[PDB]
Amino acid sequence: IPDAMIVIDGHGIIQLFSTAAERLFGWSELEAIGQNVNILMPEPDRSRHDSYISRYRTTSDPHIIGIGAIVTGKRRDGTTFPMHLSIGEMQSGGEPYFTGFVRDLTEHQQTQARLQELQ
Numbered sequence: 665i666p667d668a669m670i671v672i673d674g675h676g677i678i679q680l681f682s683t684a685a686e687r688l689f690g691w692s693e694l695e696a697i698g699q700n701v702n703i704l705m706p707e708p709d710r711s712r713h714d715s716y717i718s719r720y721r722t723t724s725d726p727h728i729i730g731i732g733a734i735v736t737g738k739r740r741d742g743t744t745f746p747m748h749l750s751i752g753e754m755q756s757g758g759e760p761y762f763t764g765f766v767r768d769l770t771e772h773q774q775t776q777a778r779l780q781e782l783q
C-alpha cells in the first residue's frame with residue numbers, strides 16, 4: 665500500500681515524486697522534480713535543509729534516517745500540516761540518493777485536538 669514517497673539527490677534536488685506525493689503536497693511530478701525538496705516545508709527548516717543534508721554527508725551521523733520523525737510539511741497552497749517522515753539511503757551512479765516516505769498526520773492531530781477540547 666503506497667504512501668507519499670519522494671526521491672532526492674545528495675543536493676536535495678527532487679528526482680522522483682510519487683502520485684500520492686502529488687495529492688498530498690499539491691505539486692505535480694513535472695513541477696516538483698527539478699526543485700529542491702525544501703519547497704515542501706516552511707521556514708526555518710526550509711532554509712536550513714541543505715545544511716541538514718550537508719551536515720549528515722560529512723558527519724555520517726543521522727538524526728532522522730533509521731529513526732524517523734514527526735515534522736511540519738507545507739503544501740503548494742501554502743497550508744502546513746503534521747507528518748511523519750522516514751528516510752532511506754541509497755546509492756546510484758556512485759552518488760548518494762535519499763528516499764523519503766511521508767505519512768500525513770492531519771486527521772490524527774485533529775482527532776487528538778478535538779478529544780482534547782471536548783474535555
Ligand code: HEM
Nearest residue numbers: 670704705709716717720726727728729735737762763764
Ligand atoms: C517535507 C518536510 C520535511 C521536513 C520538515 C524535513 C526536516 C528535516 C530536519 C529538521 C532535518 C535535520 C534536523 C536534525 O538535525 O535533526 C532533516 C534532515 C534530512 N532530511 Fe528532511 N525534511 C523534510 C523532508 C525530507 C524529504 C522529503 C527528504 C528526502 C526524500 C529529506 C531528506 C533529509 C536528509 C537526507 C536529511 C539529513 C539526514 C539525517 O539527518 O538523518 N527530508 N530534514
